[PDB]
Design a protein around this nucleic acid. Structure first.
Ligand SMILES: [Mg+2]
Lengths: 468, 258
DNA sequence: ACCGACGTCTAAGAAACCATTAT
């Protein structure tokens, strides 16, 4: 009844302005500043509005709240005080002029009443037509979707967010959609932090990045989306890649895995040729971003298991000098764990008040491991300095671990666990401490949904700034 | 393992490596659906499965009740050696072993047996909620040192009922078999579980590490009779039957140091 | 007449909807 000895991965360190490190992202931003502030890119964040006549006051109010300090009201153990956009991000947040604020057409209300989501997306993109000639006058555009259109937000086979994002993707126009959720949430500091980070990222800046990150390693994620029609179902199975270039920066791209259009698949698993094509595209991207050098070691993360054809294609896609590690992430597992503390003077061995630490990994078999991406983190609490913080306390009594299955690789579990934990903290769209899954899987899933909605935006590589 | 803190899991080791069952040779080929229909119609006191021949654990009279003398060509014995490998390779064998283990575990005890989403649950009865064997579980679910209720009616519900439950699962990992326990709340009737989501969330909201540890200890003691003894408990399925299954399950949950 | 059609059983997840906010 004794398992193998477990080890705990130290909490990943985030890099900020002047190459300073901090575990807490919001605290690091507040005390040191964004990573891209030293590069003066962006020098300013200019905004644009796209809302009906009756709801531009809401956009003005949210921008004014962004420009002014706010204090946390919920989850005070983690969230720090928001000191405004200029104080935190060191760049001004320029309000739009009269020509940079656009009006939604009156036909949008009638289209929404008729329930035609595609017509609503077309009307929104046609409304935003005037800003195409003035793209140089602003950085990020704000979209407000009133609650009166809620019937056209998400029904069978449609996603207004995904459709609008796919339509604005080839126009090189970053957008940020604001609903009534952001305006009627009690904790204003949380919304302010999330929106400010998203706006700074979409403007072209890097809020933070991992501190001790190897430039000779590349990370690839594959996730699938299912679209069902009368004939049957089809799988999107998009891809994503994470790496930093030789110079200062951070690369986050996603691309479709279909070698040619009109290719239909009924299963998430890819073939030999498809895997070879996708990994050749990834290798070409890495070589372009690293002065023509090959990665010393390659990480591929998948939601489903690796078939023999997939493994063979992966091993034949890269050279012999590149190490290949195939890991399958299983989110749902039957295992859960309890933290037990040791003897501390007079107090005997008793269960801990707070759950198992985030970063503990338990080797189960020669090919499977239990990684705890959810758990208690020390050093991030604001109220009690010495008290652990459990992010999912209002949702889960206890954290639920994830399982990693090894299909190829001779290295230890330490490198894989460190990589996954480090990648779970670079979601700029996420305003909390960490994500349960690595950001590669999240971005691949998001791009899979977007491609599923509109299949005409495939065969072009897209940055994370256009889909977060 | 070298140092604290320790990680206490919810997996109970299974020491039994071989099981002995019975084979029913049929003159006419039979499918799984027909066997399930016959089981439902006749309701035998036995456990049956079909990988390539009918494999049963229990008494011969029950099988002769299911199948007439003409259909039964012969009855034999099958030795499932290396039960871990057989469970991993054969799914039907995995389900059969899980059912046999749980039937052995919940024998001669006041705990109900229920099925949801093809997952087995052990449910505390309403009539036996006040019995002494559940005092530790009552203490674990209590608040501020006060005794807590383990069975009652869902608030703001017409006829809905709730009870404390534990989910028992069988898992194979690297040639080792584990019995997996997860505390849960059982809602009767099953099809109206969506009406008590708020109640379940409210009851489970403050079940942190200490409370979950206490609940797991209480459930282990209830299911096995001993807790923290360092030994193994022998459980038998159909002990009086000719074809019976005996399992040796450790009472100390898998733990790790370092 | 070797393969198809179709039932059983696992493991794992996507897809629509609800819910609450960090001892
Ligand atoms: Mg966003």
């Amino acid at each position: 009844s004794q398992l193998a000895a477990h080890s705990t991965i130290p909490e990943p360190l985030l890099l900020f302005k002047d190459n300073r490190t901090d575990t807490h992202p919001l605290r690091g931003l507040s005390q040191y500043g964004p990573y891209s502030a030293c590069f003066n890119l962006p020098g300013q964040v200019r905004l644009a509005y796209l809302a009906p006549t009756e709801h531009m006051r809401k956009l003005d109010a949210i921008v004014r709240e962004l420009q002014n300090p706010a204090t946390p009201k919920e989850a005070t153990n983690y969230y720090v005080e928001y000191g405004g956009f200029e104080k935190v991000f060191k760049v001004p947040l320029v309000m739009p002029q009269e020509h940079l604020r656009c009006l939604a057409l009156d036909e949008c209300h009638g289209v929404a009443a008729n329930g035609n989501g595609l017509a609503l997306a077309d009307k929104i993109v046609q409304s935003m037509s005037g800003l195409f000639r003035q793209k140089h006058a602003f950085d990020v555009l704000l979209v407000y979707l009133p609650a009166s259109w809620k019937k056209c937000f998400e029904y069978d086979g449609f996603d207004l967010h995904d459709r609008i994002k796919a339509k604005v993707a080839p126009l090189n126009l970053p957008i940020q959609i604001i609903n009534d959720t952001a305006l009627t949430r009690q904790c204003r500091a949380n919304v302010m932090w999330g929106v400010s980070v998203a706006l700074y990222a979409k403007a072209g800046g890097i809020p933070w990045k991992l501190a001790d990150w190897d430039k000779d390693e590349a990370y690839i994620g594959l996730s699938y989306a299912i679209k069902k029609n009368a004939e049957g179902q089809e799988y999107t199975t998009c891809c994503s890649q994470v790496f930093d270039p030789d110079g200062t920066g951070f690369e986050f791209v996603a691309y479709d895995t279909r070698e040619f259009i009109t290719d239909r698949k009924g299963n998430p698993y890819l073939s030999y040729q498809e895997m070879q094509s996708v990994l050749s595209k990834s290798l070409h991207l890495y070589q372009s971003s690293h002065n023509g050098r090959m990665p010393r070691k390659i990480f591929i993360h998948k939601t489903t298991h690796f078939t023999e054809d997939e493994i063979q294609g992966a091993f034949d896609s890269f050279s012999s000098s590149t190490e290949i590690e195939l890991v399958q992430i299983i989110q749902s597992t039957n295992w859960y764990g309890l933290k037990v503390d040791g003897k501390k003077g007079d107090k005997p061995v008793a269960p801990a008040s707070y759950p198992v630490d985030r970063g503990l990994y338990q080797p189960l078999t020669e090919s499977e491991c239990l990684l705890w991406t959810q758990g208690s983190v020390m050093g991030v609490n604001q109220q009690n300095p010495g008290q652990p913080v459990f992010k999912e306390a209002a949702l889960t009594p206890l954290p639920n671990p994830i399982m990693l299955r090894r299909f190829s690789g001779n290295g230890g579990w330490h490198a894989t666990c460190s990589s996954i934990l480090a990648l779970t903290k670079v979601d700029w769209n996420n305003n909390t401490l960490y994500k349960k899954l690595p950001v590669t899987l999240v971005y691949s899933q998001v791009f899979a949904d977007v491609v599923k909605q509109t299949p005409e935006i495939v065969n072009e590589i897209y940055d994370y700034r256009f889909f977060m | 393992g070298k140092s604290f803190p320790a990680l206490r899991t919810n997996a109970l080791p299974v020491v039994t490596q071989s099981i002995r069952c019975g084979v029913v040779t049929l003159a006419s080929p039979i499918t799984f659906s027909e066997l399930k229909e016959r089981i439902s119609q006749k309701s035998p006191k036995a456990l049956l499965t079909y990988t390539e021949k009918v494999l049963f654990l229990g008494g011969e009279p029950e099988i002769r009740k299911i199948f007439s003398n003409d259909e039964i060509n012969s009855i034999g014995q099958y030795y499932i050696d290396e039960i871990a490998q057989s469970v991993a390779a054969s799914t039907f064998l995995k389900s059969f072993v899980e059912e046999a283990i749980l039937t052995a575990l919940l024998r001669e005890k006041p705990i109900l047996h229920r099925v949801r989403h093809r997952t087995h649950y052990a449910v505390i009865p309403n009539a036996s909620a006040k019995d002494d064997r559940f005092l530790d579980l009552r203490k674990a679910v209590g608040f501020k040192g006060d005794l807590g209720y383990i069975t009652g009616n869902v608030t703001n519900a017409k006829e809905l009922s709730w009870a404390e439950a534990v989910s028992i699962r069988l898992e194979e990992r690297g040639g080792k078999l584990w019995i997996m326990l997860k505390p849960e709340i059982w809602i009767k009737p099953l099809d109206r579980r969506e009406e008590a989501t708020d109640f379940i969330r409210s009851r489970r909201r403050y079940r942190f590490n200490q409370c979950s540890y206490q609940i797991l200890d209480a459930w282990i003691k209830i299911l096995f009779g001993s807790i923290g003894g360092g030994g193994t408990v022998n459980i038998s399925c159909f002990p009086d039957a000719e074809f019976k299954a005996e399992f040796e399950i450790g009472t100390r949950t898998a733990f790790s140091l370092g």
